[PDB]
Amino acid sequence: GPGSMTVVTTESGLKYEDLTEGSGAEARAGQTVSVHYTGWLTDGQKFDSSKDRNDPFAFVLGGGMVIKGWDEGVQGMKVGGVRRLTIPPQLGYGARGAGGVIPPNATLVFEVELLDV
Numbered sequence: 604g605p606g607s608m609t610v611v612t613t614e615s616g617l618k619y620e621d622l623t624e625g626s627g628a629e630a631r632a633g634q635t636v637s638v639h640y641t642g643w644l645t646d647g648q649k650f651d652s653s654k655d656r657n658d659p660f661a662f663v664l665g666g667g668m669v670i671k672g673w674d675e676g677v678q679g680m681k682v683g684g685v686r687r688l689t690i691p692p693q694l695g696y697g698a699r700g701a702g703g704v705i706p707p708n709a710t711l712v713f714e715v716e717l718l719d720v
């Protein structure tokens with residue numbers, strides 16, 4: 604809902620929030636791993652789920668085709684670890700906009716869930 608949220612923010616702008624423990628291994632730029640991304644909005648509503656295809660997102664870290672927020676999240680999460688990361692416009696979409704209800708200062712959060720490396 605509209606208002607605030609208990610999420611820790613970084614100096615870059617992106618935020619993070621523990622959702623589920625893991626105790627595996629933090630991904631590293633250059634290595635390929637499989638993770639799950641859940642498109643979440645500021646209100647909390649989801650507008651994108653990997654479930655559509657039913658399969659873990661496997662790709663190479665620090666050398667793929669994602670936004671800063673994504674790389675920053677994938678280069679931090681650990682195998683078996685699940686946590687939500689707030690990806691701002693300055694590190695994702697930007698002030699370019701992507702819709703009427705999507706302002707140039709709008710922020711989007713995505714849930715990262717490491718499956719394996």
Ligand SMILES: CCOC(=O)CN1C(=O)CC(C[C@@H](O)[C@@H]2C[C@@H](C)C[C@H](C)C2=O)CC1=O
Nearest residue numbers: 640642650651668669670673695696701702
């Ligand atoms: C730079 C993107 O980075 C990636 O390469 C991976 N990525 C996308 O391609 C778009 C995703 C979100 C989309 O589903 C929305 C859907 C509506 C809101 C229209 C808008 C233009 C979109 O595209 C977020 C994402 O992480």
